[PDB]
Coordinates of C-alpha atoms (C1' of nucleotides) and ligand atoms in Angstrom, one line a residue:
Chain A
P2 CA 95.3 133.9 73.3
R3 CA 98.5 133.4 75.5
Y4 CA 98.7 135.4 78.5
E5 CA 96.0 136.8 80.8
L6 CA 96.5 139.4 83.1
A7 CA 94.4 139.6 86.4
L8 CA 94.8 143.3 87.8
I9 CA 93.5 144.3 91.1
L10 CA 93.4 148.1 90.7
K11 CA 92.9 150.6 93.6
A12 CA 88.8 152.0 93.8
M13 CA 89.1 155.5 91.9
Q14 CA 86.9 157.7 90.0
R15 CA 86.5 157.6 85.9
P16 CA 89.9 159.8 84.8
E17 CA 92.9 157.9 86.8
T18 CA 91.0 154.4 85.9
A19 CA 91.7 155.2 82.5
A20 CA 95.1 156.8 83.7
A21 CA 96.5 153.7 84.9
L22 CA 94.4 151.3 82.4
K23 CA 96.3 153.3 79.7
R24 CA 99.5 153.1 81.2
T25 CA 99.7 149.6 81.9
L26 CA 98.7 148.8 78.5
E27 CA 101.6 151.2 77.1
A28 CA 104.1 148.9 80.0
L29 CA 102.7 145.8 77.9
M30 CA 103.2 147.1 74.6
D31 CA 106.7 148.6 75.6
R32 CA 108.1 144.8 76.4
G33 CA 106.8 144.4 72.8
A34 CA 103.7 142.7 73.8
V35 CA 100.4 142.4 71.7
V36 CA 97.2 143.1 73.3
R37 CA 93.8 141.1 72.1
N38 CA 90.8 142.4 74.5
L39 CA 90.7 144.7 77.7
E40 CA 88.1 143.7 80.1
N41 CA 86.5 145.0 83.0
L42 CA 84.7 143.2 85.8
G43 CA 83.0 145.7 88.0
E44 CA 84.8 147.1 90.8
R45 CA 83.8 145.4 94.2
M46 CA 84.1 144.7 97.4
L47 CA 87.2 142.4 97.6
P48 CA 87.0 138.9 99.1
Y49 CA 89.4 140.4 101.7
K50 CA 91.2 143.6 103.2
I51 CA 94.6 143.5 101.0
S52 CA 97.7 145.6 102.0
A53 CA 99.5 146.9 99.2
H54 CA 102.0 149.9 99.5
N55 CA 101.1 151.7 102.6
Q56 CA 97.6 151.2 102.4
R57 CA 95.1 148.4 103.6
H58 CA 92.1 148.6 100.5
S59 CA 88.7 147.3 101.3
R60 CA 87.0 147.8 97.6
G61 CA 88.5 147.2 94.2
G62 CA 88.3 147.3 90.4
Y63 CA 88.8 144.1 88.4
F64 CA 90.4 143.9 85.1
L65 CA 91.8 141.5 82.7
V66 CA 94.1 141.9 80.0
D67 CA 94.7 139.1 77.2
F68 CA 97.9 139.6 75.1
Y69 CA 100.9 137.7 73.6
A70 CA 104.4 138.2 75.3
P71 CA 107.6 136.3 74.5
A72 CA 108.6 133.8 77.6
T73 CA 111.7 136.2 78.6
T74 CA 109.4 139.0 78.9
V75 CA 107.0 138.3 81.3
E76 CA 109.0 138.1 84.5
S77 CA 109.7 142.2 83.3
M78 CA 106.2 143.1 83.5
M79 CA 105.6 141.8 86.6
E80 CA 108.2 144.1 88.0
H81 CA 106.7 147.3 86.5
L82 CA 102.9 146.0 87.8
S83 CA 105.1 145.5 91.5
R84 CA 106.5 149.1 92.0
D85 CA 103.3 150.7 90.6
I86 CA 101.5 152.4 94.0
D87 CA 98.1 152.2 92.3
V88 CA 98.0 148.3 91.8
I89 CA 96.3 146.4 94.5
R90 CA 97.3 142.7 93.1
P91 CA 98.8 141.7 89.9
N92 CA 98.8 138.4 88.5
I93 CA 99.7 136.8 85.2
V94 CA 98.4 133.5 84.4
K95 CA 98.8 131.1 81.0
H96 CA 95.3 132.0 79.1
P97 CA 92.7 129.8 79.9
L98 CA 91.4 128.9 76.7
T99 CA 94.8 127.6 75.1
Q100 CA 94.3 124.8 77.5
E101 CA 92.5 121.6 75.7
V102 CA 88.9 120.0 76.7
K103 CA 89.7 116.4 76.2
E104 CA 86.4 115.2 76.4
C105 CA 85.1 113.5 80.1
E106 CA 84.0 110.4 78.7
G107 CA 82.0 109.6 81.6
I108 CA 82.9 107.5 84.7
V109 CA 84.4 104.2 83.9
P110 CA 83.4 102.0 86.7
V111 CA 85.7 100.5 88.8
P112 CA 84.6 97.2 90.4
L113 CA 85.8 95.3 93.5
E114 CA 89.4 94.1 93.2
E115 CA 90.1 90.7 94.0
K116 CA 93.2 88.2 94.2
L117 CA 94.9 90.0 96.6
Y118 CA 94.6 87.5 99.6
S119 CA 95.6 84.1 99.0
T120 CA 93.4 81.2 99.1
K121 CA 93.4 79.6 102.7
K122 CA 91.3 77.5 104.4
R123 CA 91.2 79.1 107.8
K124 CA 89.1 78.7 110.3
Chain B
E119 CA 98.3 113.1 57.2
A120 CA 100.0 115.9 55.1
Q121 CA 96.5 117.1 53.8
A122 CA 94.6 117.1 57.3
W123 CA 98.3 119.4 58.5
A124 CA 98.0 121.5 55.7
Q125 CA 94.2 122.5 56.3
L126 CA 94.6 123.1 59.8
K127 CA 97.4 125.2 59.9
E128 CA 95.4 127.4 56.8
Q129 CA 92.3 127.2 59.2
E130 CA 94.2 128.5 61.9
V131 CA 96.5 131.1 60.5
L132 CA 93.3 132.6 58.8
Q133 CA 92.0 132.6 62.0
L134 CA 94.3 134.8 63.5
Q135 CA 94.3 137.1 59.9
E136 CA 90.6 137.3 61.2
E137 CA 91.3 138.4 65.2
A138 CA 94.6 140.5 63.6
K139 CA 91.5 143.3 62.7
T140 CA 90.4 142.9 66.5
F141 CA 93.6 143.9 68.1
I142 CA 94.6 146.8 70.5
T143 CA 96.7 149.3 68.9
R144 CA 98.3 152.6 69.6
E145 CA 95.5 154.8 68.8
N146 CA 92.8 152.2 70.0
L147 CA 93.9 153.0 73.3
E148 CA 91.9 156.0 74.1
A149 CA 88.8 154.0 72.7
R150 CA 89.1 150.5 74.1
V151 CA 90.1 152.3 77.7
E152 CA 87.1 154.0 77.6
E153 CA 84.8 151.4 76.1
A154 CA 85.9 148.8 78.6
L155 CA 84.9 151.2 81.4
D156 CA 81.4 151.4 80.2
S157 CA 80.8 147.9 79.6
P158 CA 81.3 145.0 82.7
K159 CA 81.3 141.5 81.5
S160 CA 80.0 139.1 83.8
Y161 CA 81.9 135.9 84.1
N162 CA 80.1 134.7 87.2
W163 CA 78.5 131.3 86.0
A164 CA 76.5 128.5 87.8
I165 CA 74.9 125.2 87.7
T166 CA 72.5 122.6 88.3
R167 CA 72.4 118.8 89.1
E168 CA 71.0 117.9 85.5
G169 CA 73.8 119.3 83.9
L170 CA 72.0 122.8 82.7
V171 CA 73.8 126.2 83.1
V172 CA 72.4 128.9 84.6
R173 CA 74.1 132.2 84.1
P174 CA 73.1 135.4 86.4
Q175 CA 69.7 136.6 86.2
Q176 CA 68.6 138.7 83.6
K177 CA 68.7 142.7 84.5
Chain C
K1 CA 111.9 87.7 117.3
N2 CA 114.2 89.0 114.8
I3 CA 114.4 91.8 117.4
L4 CA 116.8 89.3 119.2
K5 CA 119.2 89.7 117.0
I6 CA 118.8 92.9 116.4
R7 CA 119.2 93.8 120.0
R8 CA 122.3 92.1 120.4
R9 CA 123.8 94.4 117.5
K10 CA 122.2 97.4 119.2
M11 CA 123.9 96.6 122.8
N12 CA 127.1 95.6 120.6
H13 CA 127.0 98.9 119.6
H14 CA 126.6 101.0 121.8
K15 CA 129.1 99.3 124.3
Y16 CA 131.3 100.3 121.0
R17 CA 130.7 103.9 120.9
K18 CA 130.9 104.5 125.0
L19 CA 134.7 102.5 124.4
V20 CA 135.5 105.2 121.7
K21 CA 134.7 108.2 123.7
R22 CA 137.3 106.9 126.8
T23 CA 139.8 105.1 124.2
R24 CA 139.6 107.8 122.2
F25 CA 142.6 110.1 122.5
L26 CA 144.4 107.1 122.8
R27 CA 143.2 106.1 119.7
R28 CA 144.2 109.5 118.0
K29 CA 147.6 108.9 119.3
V30 CA 148.0 105.5 117.7
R31 CA 146.4 106.8 114.1
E32 CA 148.6 109.7 113.5
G33 CA 151.3 107.3 114.8
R34 CA 150.5 104.9 111.9
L35 CA 150.0 107.9 109.2
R36 CA 153.8 108.6 110.4
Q37 CA 154.8 105.0 109.4
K38 CA 152.5 105.3 106.1
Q39 CA 154.4 108.6 105.0
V40 CA 157.4 106.6 105.6
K41 CA 156.8 103.6 103.9
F42 CA 155.5 105.5 101.1
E43 CA 159.0 107.3 101.0
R44 CA 160.7 104.3 101.1
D45 CA 158.7 103.0 98.3
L46 CA 160.1 105.9 96.1
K47 CA 163.7 105.7 97.3
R48 CA 164.0 102.4 96.4
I49 CA 163.2 103.1 92.8
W50 CA 165.7 106.0 92.2
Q51 CA 168.1 103.6 93.8
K52 CA 167.1 100.8 91.7
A53 CA 166.8 102.8 88.8
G54 CA 170.7 103.4 89.4
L55 CA 170.0 107.2 90.2
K56 CA 171.8 107.9 93.3
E57 CA 169.8 111.3 93.9
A58 CA 166.0 112.3 93.5
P59 CA 165.1 113.4 90.2
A60 CA 165.1 117.2 89.1
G61 CA 162.1 119.1 91.0
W62 CA 161.1 116.2 93.4
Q63 CA 159.8 117.4 96.9
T64 CA 158.3 114.2 97.5
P65 CA 154.3 116.0 98.7
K66 CA 153.0 114.3 102.0
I67 CA 149.5 112.9 101.1
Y68 CA 148.8 110.6 104.3
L69 CA 149.6 113.4 106.6
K70 CA 147.2 116.1 104.9
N71 CA 145.3 118.1 107.1
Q72 CA 142.8 121.0 106.3
Chain D
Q65 CA 127.1 129.2 68.6
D66 CA 123.9 129.4 66.3
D67 CA 121.4 131.5 65.8
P68 CA 117.7 130.7 64.7
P69 CA 116.5 134.2 63.9
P70 CA 113.4 136.2 66.1
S71 CA 111.3 136.4 62.7
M72 CA 111.8 132.6 61.6
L73 CA 108.3 132.0 61.5
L74 CA 107.5 128.7 63.0
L75 CA 108.1 125.5 61.8
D76 CA 104.6 124.3 61.6
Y77 CA 103.6 127.7 60.1
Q78 CA 106.7 127.9 57.5
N79 CA 104.9 125.8 54.7
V80 CA 101.3 126.6 54.6
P81 CA 100.5 129.3 51.5
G82 CA 99.8 132.8 51.7
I83 CA 101.8 133.5 54.5
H84 CA 104.0 136.2 53.2
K85 CA 101.6 138.7 52.4
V86 CA 100.0 138.5 55.6
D87 CA 100.2 141.8 58.0
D88 CA 103.2 142.4 60.2
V89 CA 101.1 141.6 63.6
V90 CA 100.7 138.1 62.8
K91 CA 104.1 137.7 61.4
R92 CA 104.9 139.1 64.9
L93 CA 102.7 136.3 66.4
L94 CA 103.4 133.1 64.6
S95 CA 107.4 134.5 64.7
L96 CA 109.8 132.7 67.2
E97 CA 109.6 136.0 69.1
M98 CA 106.4 135.0 70.8
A99 CA 107.2 131.1 70.9
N100 CA 108.2 128.6 73.7
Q101 CA 111.4 127.5 73.7
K102 CA 110.1 123.7 72.3
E103 CA 109.2 125.7 69.4
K104 CA 113.0 127.2 68.7
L105 CA 114.4 123.5 69.5
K106 CA 111.8 122.2 66.8
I107 CA 113.7 124.5 64.4
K108 CA 117.7 123.7 65.6
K109 CA 116.3 120.1 65.0
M110 CA 115.0 120.9 61.5
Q111 CA 118.3 122.8 60.9
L112 CA 120.8 120.2 61.9
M113 CA 119.2 117.1 60.4
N114 CA 119.0 118.9 57.0
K115 CA 122.7 120.2 57.1
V116 CA 124.3 117.3 58.7
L117 CA 122.1 114.1 57.4
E118 CA 121.5 112.4 53.9
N119 CA 117.9 111.2 54.3
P120 CA 116.1 114.1 56.5
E121 CA 113.0 111.7 56.5
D122 CA 114.3 108.9 58.4
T123 CA 113.3 109.0 62.4
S124 CA 114.7 105.5 62.5
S125 CA 117.9 105.9 61.1
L126 CA 121.1 105.7 64.0
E127 CA 122.4 108.8 62.4
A128 CA 119.0 110.8 62.6
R129 CA 118.8 109.6 66.2
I130 CA 122.2 110.9 67.3
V131 CA 121.4 114.4 65.9
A132 CA 118.4 114.8 67.8
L133 CA 120.2 113.9 71.1
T134 CA 122.8 116.2 70.0
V135 CA 120.1 119.0 70.2
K136 CA 118.3 117.9 73.5
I137 CA 122.2 117.7 75.0
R138 CA 123.1 121.2 73.5
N139 CA 119.6 122.5 75.2
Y140 CA 120.9 121.3 78.5
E141 CA 124.0 122.7 78.5
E142 CA 122.7 126.0 78.4
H143 CA 119.9 124.7 81.2
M144 CA 123.1 123.7 83.2
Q145 CA 124.8 126.9 82.6
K146 CA 122.1 128.8 83.8
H147 CA 121.4 126.6 87.1
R148 CA 124.3 125.2 88.6
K149 CA 122.5 123.4 91.2
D150 CA 120.2 121.3 89.5
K151 CA 120.7 117.7 89.8
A152 CA 118.1 116.4 88.0
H153 CA 118.8 117.9 84.7
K154 CA 122.6 117.2 85.1
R155 CA 121.6 113.7 85.6
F156 CA 119.3 114.0 82.1
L157 CA 122.7 115.5 80.6
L158 CA 125.0 113.2 81.8
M159 CA 123.3 109.8 80.4
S160 CA 121.8 112.0 77.5
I161 CA 125.6 112.0 76.2
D162 CA 126.2 108.2 77.1
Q163 CA 123.5 107.1 75.0
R164 CA 124.5 109.4 72.1
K165 CA 128.1 107.8 72.5
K166 CA 126.6 104.2 73.0
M167 CA 124.8 104.8 69.2
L168 CA 128.1 106.6 67.7
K169 CA 130.0 103.0 68.8
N170 CA 126.7 101.5 67.3
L171 CA 127.7 103.4 64.1
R172 CA 131.6 103.1 63.9
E173 CA 131.0 99.4 64.3
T174 CA 128.5 99.3 61.0
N175 CA 128.8 102.2 58.8
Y176 CA 132.4 104.0 58.6
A177 CA 132.3 107.1 56.3
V178 CA 128.9 108.1 57.2
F179 CA 130.0 107.8 60.9
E180 CA 132.9 109.8 60.1
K181 CA 130.9 112.6 58.6
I182 CA 128.7 112.7 61.3
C183 CA 131.8 113.0 63.5
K184 CA 133.4 115.9 61.5
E185 CA 129.6 117.8 61.4
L186 CA 128.2 118.2 64.8
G187 CA 131.3 118.1 66.4
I188 CA 131.6 115.2 68.5
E189 CA 134.9 113.6 68.7
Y190 CA 134.6 109.9 69.4
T191 CA 137.0 108.8 72.3
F192 CA 138.2 104.9 73.2
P193 CA 136.6 104.0 76.5
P194 CA 139.8 103.0 78.2
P195 CA 141.2 99.2 79.5
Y196 CA 140.5 99.2 83.3
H197 CA 138.6 101.9 84.9
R198 CA 140.0 102.2 88.5
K199 CA 140.0 105.5 90.7
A200 CA 143.0 107.5 90.2
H201 CA 143.9 108.4 93.8
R202 CA 146.5 110.5 95.3
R203 CA 148.9 108.0 96.2
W204 CA 148.9 106.3 92.7
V205 CA 149.0 109.5 90.4
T206 CA 152.0 110.6 92.7
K207 CA 153.6 107.4 92.5
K208 CA 153.4 107.2 88.3
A209 CA 154.2 110.8 88.4
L210 CA 157.5 110.3 90.0
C211 CA 158.0 107.2 87.9
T212 CA 157.8 108.8 84.8
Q213 CA 160.4 111.4 85.9
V214 CA 162.7 108.6 86.6
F215 CA 162.2 107.3 83.3
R216 CA 162.9 110.6 81.3
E217 CA 165.9 110.8 83.7
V218 CA 167.4 107.3 83.0
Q219 CA 167.1 107.5 79.4
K220 CA 168.7 111.5 79.3
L221 CA 171.8 110.0 81.3
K222 CA 171.7 106.9 78.5
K223 CA 172.1 109.6 76.0
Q224 CA 174.7 111.4 77.6
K225 CA 176.8 108.2 78.5
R226 CA 176.7 106.8 74.8
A227 CA 177.3 110.4 73.3
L228 CA 180.5 110.6 75.2
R229 CA 181.4 107.1 74.0
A230 CA 180.3 108.5 70.1
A231 CA 182.3 111.4 70.6
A232 CA 185.3 109.8 72.2
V233 CA 185.3 106.9 69.6
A234 CA 185.1 109.5 67.1
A235 CA 187.9 112.3 68.2
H236 CA 189.9 109.0 68.1
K237 CA 189.1 108.0 64.5
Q238 CA 189.5 111.1 63.2
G239 CA 193.0 111.9 65.1
Chain E
rA1 C1' 116.0 124.0 89.2
rG2 C1' 115.0 129.1 89.3
rA3 C1' 112.1 134.1 89.6
rG4 C1' 107.9 136.5 91.8
rU5 C1' 103.7 136.5 95.3
rU6 C1' 100.9 135.0 100.3
rA7 C1' 95.4 132.8 102.7
rA8 C1' 95.0 130.8 108.1
rA9 C1' 97.5 131.4 112.6
rU10 C1' 101.3 133.3 115.4
rU11 C1' 104.4 137.5 117.6
rA12 C1' 106.8 142.7 117.8
rU13 C1' 104.6 146.5 119.3
rA14 C1' 101.0 150.2 120.7
rA15 C1' 95.2 151.4 122.4
rC16 C1' 91.2 150.1 125.6
rU17 C1' 89.5 146.4 130.1
rA18 C1' 90.8 142.8 134.0
rA19 C1' 93.6 141.3 138.0
rG20 C1' 95.4 137.3 137.9
rC21 C1' 97.9 133.9 133.6
rU22 C1' 99.9 129.5 132.2
rG23 C1' 100.2 124.0 133.4
rU24 C1' 98.8 119.2 134.7
rA25 C1' 95.9 112.8 137.1
rA26 C1' 96.8 116.3 141.1
rA27 C1' 100.3 120.3 142.2
rA28 C1' 104.5 123.3 142.8
rA29 C1' 107.6 126.3 139.3
rG30 C1' 107.2 129.9 136.0
rC31 C1' 105.5 134.6 134.6
rC32 C1' 102.4 139.2 136.4
rC33 C1' 107.2 143.9 130.6
rU34 C1' 100.8 139.3 132.6
rA35 C1' 95.5 137.9 129.9
rG36 C1' 91.0 139.1 127.2
rU37 C1' 89.8 142.5 123.0
rU38 C1' 91.1 145.8 118.9
rA39 C1' 94.4 147.0 115.4
rA40 C1' 99.6 145.1 112.5
rA41 C1' 104.6 144.0 109.0
rA42 C1' 109.3 140.5 108.9
rU43 C1' 110.3 134.6 109.6
rA44 C1' 108.4 130.0 109.7
rA45 C1' 105.3 126.5 108.3
rA46 C1' 102.2 125.1 104.0
rA47 C1' 93.7 123.1 107.0
rU48 C1' 90.3 121.6 103.6
rA49 C1' 90.4 119.5 98.5
rA50 C1' 92.6 113.6 99.4
rC51 C1' 87.7 108.4 100.3
rC52 C1' 92.5 110.9 95.0
rC53 C1' 97.3 107.1 93.2
rA54 C1' 99.7 111.6 89.7
rC55 C1' 105.2 112.6 89.0
rG56 C1' 110.6 111.5 89.6
rA57 C1' 115.6 106.6 88.6
rA58 C1' 115.9 106.5 94.4
rA59 C1' 115.9 109.8 98.1
rG60 C1' 111.5 112.5 97.4
rU61 C1' 107.0 115.3 95.8
rG62 C1' 100.8 117.7 97.2
rA63 C1' 100.0 126.8 99.0
rC64 C1' 100.0 130.9 94.3
rU65 C1' 102.4 132.4 89.3
rC66 C1' 105.3 132.1 85.0
rU67 C1' 109.9 130.5 82.7
rA68 C1' 113.4 126.2 81.9
rA69 C1' 112.2 120.8 81.8
rU70 C1' 111.6 115.0 82.4
rA71 C1' 117.7 110.1 79.1
rA72 C1' 117.1 106.5 75.4
rU73 C1' 113.5 102.7 68.3
rC74 C1' 113.7 101.1 74.8
rC75 C1' 118.0 92.9 76.5
rU76 C1' 121.6 93.1 81.3
rG77 C1' 125.6 95.5 83.4
rA78 C1' 130.6 97.1 87.7
rC79 C1' 134.7 98.6 92.5
rA80 C1' 133.7 103.5 87.0
rC81 C1' 130.3 108.1 86.5
rA82 C1' 126.8 111.2 88.7
rC83 C1' 122.8 111.0 92.7
rG84 C1' 121.3 109.9 97.9
rA85 C1' 116.2 111.3 103.7
rU86 C1' 117.0 112.7 108.5
rA87 C1' 121.0 114.1 111.7
rG88 C1' 125.9 116.1 111.4
rC89 C1' 130.4 119.6 109.9
rU90 C1' 132.6 124.5 107.7
rA91 C1' 131.5 130.2 106.8
rG92 C1' 127.6 134.2 106.3
rG93 C1' 122.9 135.1 106.9
rA94 C1' 117.8 134.5 109.5
rC95 C1' 114.8 133.2 114.5
rC96 C1' 107.2 133.3 114.8
rC97 C1' 107.1 128.1 116.5
rA98 C1' 109.6 123.6 117.9
rA99 C1' 113.6 121.8 120.7
rA100 C1' 118.7 117.8 121.8
rC101 C1' 121.6 119.9 125.8
rU102 C1' 121.4 122.5 130.7
rG103 C1' 118.6 125.1 134.6
rG104 C1' 114.3 125.2 137.3
rG105 C1' 109.2 122.3 139.6
rA106 C1' 107.0 117.7 140.5
rU107 C1' 106.9 112.7 140.6
rU108 C1' 110.1 108.7 143.6
rA109 C1' 113.7 104.6 148.1
rG110 C1' 116.6 107.2 143.5
rA111 C1' 114.5 109.8 138.5
rU112 C1' 120.5 111.9 135.2
rA113 C1' 113.2 109.9 133.0
rC114 C1' 108.2 109.5 131.8
rC115 C1' 104.8 115.0 134.0
rC116 C1' 105.0 121.3 133.8
rC117 C1' 108.2 125.9 133.1
rA118 C1' 111.6 128.2 130.4
rC119 C1' 115.8 128.7 127.0
rU120 C1' 120.0 127.0 123.5
rA121 C1' 122.8 124.5 119.5
rU122 C1' 119.5 122.9 116.1
rG123 C1' 115.5 122.7 112.4
rC124 C1' 115.1 127.9 107.9
rC125 C1' 118.1 130.6 103.2
rU126 C1' 123.2 130.7 100.5
rA127 C1' 127.9 128.3 99.2
rG128 C1' 130.7 123.7 100.3
rC129 C1' 131.0 119.2 102.5
rC130 C1' 129.6 114.3 105.2
rC131 C1' 127.6 109.6 101.8
rU132 C1' 124.2 107.1 106.5
rA133 C1' 118.3 104.8 107.6
rA134 C1' 113.9 99.1 109.3
rA135 C1' 117.3 104.1 102.5
rC136 C1' 112.0 97.5 103.7
rC137 C1' 107.1 97.2 99.6
rC138 C1' 113.0 93.2 104.1
rA139 C1' 110.0 90.6 97.4
rA140 C1' 116.8 92.4 91.8
rA141 C1' 116.3 93.4 86.5
rU142 C1' 113.8 91.8 81.2
rA143 C1' 110.7 88.8 79.3
rG144 C1' 106.9 85.8 79.9
rU145 C1' 102.6 81.5 82.1
rU146 C1' 98.8 80.4 85.6
rA147 C1' 99.9 74.4 83.3
rC148 C1' 103.2 71.4 88.0
rA149 C1' 102.0 72.8 93.0
rU150 C1' 100.0 73.6 98.8
rA151 C1' 106.8 72.5 104.8
rA152 C1' 104.8 76.7 107.9
rC153 C1' 103.1 82.2 107.7
rA154 C1' 103.2 86.1 104.8
rA155 C1' 102.4 89.5 99.3
rA156 C1' 99.2 82.4 95.4
rA157 C1' 102.8 79.0 91.9
rC158 C1' 106.4 79.1 87.9
rU159 C1' 110.1 79.2 83.7
rA160 C1' 114.1 82.0 80.4
Ligands
MG301 MG1 93.2 84.0 103.5
MG302 MG1 127.4 91.7 123.0
MG303 MG1 146.8 101.2 114.6
MG304 MG1 129.2 95.3 72.4
MG305 MG1 168.1 105.0 72.8
MG306 MG1 116.8 128.9 96.1
MG307 MG1 99.5 139.1 119.9
MG308 MG1 94.2 118.0 132.1
MG309 MG1 103.6 130.4 142.5
MG310 MG1 94.5 114.9 104.5
MG311 MG1 100.9 108.7 97.9
MG312 MG1 110.6 122.1 77.5
MG313 MG1 111.2 108.2 80.4
MG314 MG1 114.9 101.2 82.8
MG315 MG1 119.8 99.3 82.2
MG316 MG1 122.8 113.8 102.7
MG317 MG1 122.1 120.8 108.5
MG318 MG1 125.3 127.8 111.4
MG319 MG1 117.0 129.8 118.8
MG320 MG1 112.9 138.9 114.3
MG321 MG1 109.4 129.4 123.3
MG322 MG1 116.3 118.1 136.5
MG323 MG1 109.7 103.4 143.0
MG324 MG1 104.4 105.9 133.4
MG325 MG1 112.7 131.7 122.3
MG326 MG1 116.2 120.9 104.4
MG327 MG1 112.0 105.1 102.9
MG328 MG1 108.8 98.8 106.1
MG329 MG1 109.3 103.1 99.6
MG330 MG1 118.7 96.4 103.0
MG331 MG1 117.2 88.7 106.6
MG332 MG1 119.9 95.2 88.5
MG333 MG1 104.3 79.0 82.6
MG334 MG1 98.8 73.1 109.0

RNA sequence: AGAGUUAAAUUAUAACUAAGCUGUAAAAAGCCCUAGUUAAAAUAAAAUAACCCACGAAAGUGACUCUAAUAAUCCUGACACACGAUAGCUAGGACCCAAACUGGGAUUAGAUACCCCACUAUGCCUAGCCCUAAACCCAAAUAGUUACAUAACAAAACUA
């Protein structure tokens, strides 16, 4: 997977939820994006109250959209989630599973350093 | 090393061939939307000092 | 220590700045007078070139620009 | 300006078997459509290093390095067209260019014909580093402008003085 | 270098409550269109992580996300070429906070200061300059070696 879309959406009922989800996904496919999977993390009380579009929201729906999109495109996508009155906050992050795990080998111990101060017979 | 690279790229291309069937398309919109609405997946994860993982408790 | 060399400089610099304020406008007069010699000696350097190269007048299309007196 | 097409099927995926029977979704993902800019640079690199060169296999060749450098250079040229305030990159570019000119010098010393080919293909025109790097300033460039004027006036008036005598001695010799 | 984003704080400005609030060794001045609590954008600045030691040629760089991206099959090299912290200049914006300056209050033989109160250029953004620092790690660059060896101190001594 290439890009990840963290969506926090206004807390709602079922219909308008499916509405926001689909229309957003269609914006994505519209910029040329290709969607791998769609993930709902539940609806929770947010870590803090966020102020979006003349509204300070307490609760919210949590969503994850993983997709492939071209470099040029990404900026545009953000604009489209930006003016959207129902999005409590957009973010697009380089997808976590692209990043490599190069093995933590362990702790290679750092011994005490020597030959800093010169040998002097002082006092 | 030409062998090695040929193999790797073959593995990859066939993997994306596999996941090509799993994608969300103009059709899958109504289906997948209402499917994910149904099924919350938890990413929540914890750790213990031994290195053992303990995921969220079974419900 | 070495400060005592440096301290000298400090005083010797400070005492300069003071001077440059009091003597300031006097210094402007002398300076602009000095550009007024500059541009002129430039001129003679060129006139000497016509009058060595034999032409009485300056070559066609020569206004002989003022560089030293340039401002703005 | 050249154009490594949207459908060009990323360089590391180009030579693997059974690609062209595959569905449009995966050909859309492995297209230069979804790629970083580094991949499109790998492509421009491939193409330039085939068209200009002889032995595309040699990296160590002075010539192939000249090419790759020209690629990075061109990349930085667009990048410096977009960002006009970015000094870091401007330095990258301005140095890169002189490394290229250093090694072009190195080739004009060793292999002539190949060097002439590289000049003809990539668009690089090798010019001599001049004698005496100096700072041309107002006064000097001015004095030189005048001097050139005085010169082109003196030889002109000389031509008038010699043609008056050519016309007079000719008109006396004829009748 | 762009483009977007904001966590804690602060403040406009409202609503309750209190008459005091701010400030020092100690006091005055100052504000009471003040303070506390409850609400809240804009600008600015980026706790902790860091007991880390990465990146950049140096200056520098440690809030968040993405795009662009780190010269050289790699010795040295100018007065040439491109950079360069703070402060400063020019024009257009910004202004919560800080603050040269100036004005009050004290301190004092005096106080053009140290201490307090305001408040400005000025720090901030865009374009263009100016090209200076104890720009210092006061240790030139690139190969090397730990053999000879202690002026003194400090970052032990040397070849090419
Ligand atoms: Mg010692
Ligand atoms: Mg003196
Ligand atoms: Mg003089
Ligand atoms: Mg040479
Ligand atoms: Mg002649
Ligand atoms: Mg900017
Ligand atoms: Mg307040
Ligand atoms: Mg106190
Ligand atoms: Mg009072
Ligand atoms: Mg710290
Ligand atoms: Mg550090
Ligand atoms: Mg790149
Ligand atoms: Mg490098
Ligand atoms: Mg080097
Ligand atoms: Mg060098
Ligand atoms: Mg500067
Ligand atoms: Mg400034
Ligand atoms: Mg201004
Ligand atoms: Mg101000
Ligand atoms: Mg304001
Ligand atoms: Mg203030
Ligand atoms: Mg006073
Ligand atoms: Mg006294
Ligand atoms: Mg004292
Ligand atoms: Mg103020
Ligand atoms: Mg600044
Ligand atoms: Mg420094
Ligand atoms: Mg120092
Ligand atoms: Mg330093
Ligand atoms: Mg020095
Ligand atoms: Mg010295
Ligand atoms: Mg050097
Ligand atoms: Mg040795
Ligand atoms: Mg001794």
